[PDB]
Ligand binder design. Sequence first.
Ligand SMILES: CN1[C@@H]2CC[C@H]1C[C@@H](OC(=O)[C@H](CO)c1ccccc1)C2
Ligand SMILES: CN1[C@@H]2CC[C@H]1C[C@@H](OC(=O)[C@H](CO)c1ccccc1)C2
Ligand SMILES: C[N+](C)(C)CCO
Ligand SMILES: C[N+](C)(C)CCO
Ligand SMILES: C[N+](C)(C)CCO
Ligand SMILES: C[N+](C)(C)CCO
Ligand SMILES: C[N+](C)(C)CCO
Length: 311
Amino acid sequence: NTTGGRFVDKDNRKYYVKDDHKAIYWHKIDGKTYYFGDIGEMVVGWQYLEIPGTGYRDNLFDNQPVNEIGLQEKWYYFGQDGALLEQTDKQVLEAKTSENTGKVYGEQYPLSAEKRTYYFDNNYAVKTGWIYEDGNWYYLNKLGNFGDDSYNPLPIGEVAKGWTQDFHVTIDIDRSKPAPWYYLDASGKMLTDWQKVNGKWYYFGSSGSMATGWKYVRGKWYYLDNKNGDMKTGWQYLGNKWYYLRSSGAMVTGWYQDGLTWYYLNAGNGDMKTGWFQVNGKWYYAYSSGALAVNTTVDGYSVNYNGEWVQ
Ligand SMILES: CN1[C@@H]2CC[C@H]1C[C@@H](OC(=O)[C@H](CO)c1ccccc1)C2
Ligand SMILES: CN1[C@@H]2CC[C@H]1C[C@@H](OC(=O)[C@H](CO)c1ccccc1)C2
Ligand SMILES: C[N+](C)(C)CCO
Ligand SMILES: C[N+](C)(C)CCO
Ligand SMILES: C[N+](C)(C)CCO
Ligand SMILES: C[N+](C)(C)CCO
Ligand SMILES: C[N+](C)(C)CCO
């Protein structure tokens, strides 16, 4: 909705001039959309810009005041004629690199020999976050790379691979909200259920998020590292209590013999018993190591070879 002007070629740049003024930022002109930066030069190709539509960066000319405004920046694609690609689904385009972004009409730059499928939101911006494609989930980076007073927005919108945290983010990471870990394979597909990664087992369930701590899966209990997620095995001291996990990771309950020694893991909680305890009417004593006492005396009471108390 900007009329009364005309495009102008001058000094190897292109502008839109009306009543002798230069257009700047966003403008809707005769069915298409263009962006002319801060001083009027029409942009082309990949651009990381403040979202249009609010009016604060729209329909403006260099002879008008430009207000302070905090608008998020996102990725957009413009044709070589300056027209914004108003895609709302997806399109295969030249990959955005460190040498084909932020260019203006008349500037010289290479065209990526590599192309990628880019997804877009309903407002023509490159889409970020989770997406569901052909039976699988994919994660499109929400953030670029940080580096001590440094930030590179290039990775944004790209398909994430490997271990990835899904932070809540607008202009910055919302550190108050949760940021679960996920794992996307070589083609970007999100993994589910049990998975062995870098020599260790992890559980991503049905939602994909990496489990931590105790987890009940298909009738058994597993303990995934509270912080790292990796599945534990063997003896583990958790919450001031001992537990024995099979090599499969599953928690053991009942009587267990380690070498020659017998231990009793609580039927309900699975925690190792110490002191005198009773099993199915019978009485037994386990030392502080959890080790069952056999054929000997304990503070006056005798126990046979099965550790059973005998009157
Ligand atoms: C392979 N994963 C482990 C370490 C790298 C990723 C992240 C996983 O989840 C985490 O919480 C780890 C714990 O060290 C982590 C590493 C670095 C920053 C934040 C979290 C564990
Ligand atoms: C939770 N269960 C699944 C993943 C671990 C356990 C047992 C099965 O997985 C395995 O048996 C794998 C096979 O490589 C395994 C890895 C390391 C030691 C033992 C078994 C299914
Ligand atoms: C992978 N998700 C879409 C499925 C679930 C949590 O974000
Ligand atoms: C033993 N737990 C994993 C089973 C239950 C919480 O006390
Ligand atoms: C079971 N008792 C007879 C053995 C010991 C006291 O708790
Ligand atoms: C750790 N312990 C006391 C539990 C068991 C011996 O392997
Ligand atoms: C000897 N028991 C009581 C310890 C274990 C099952 O045979």
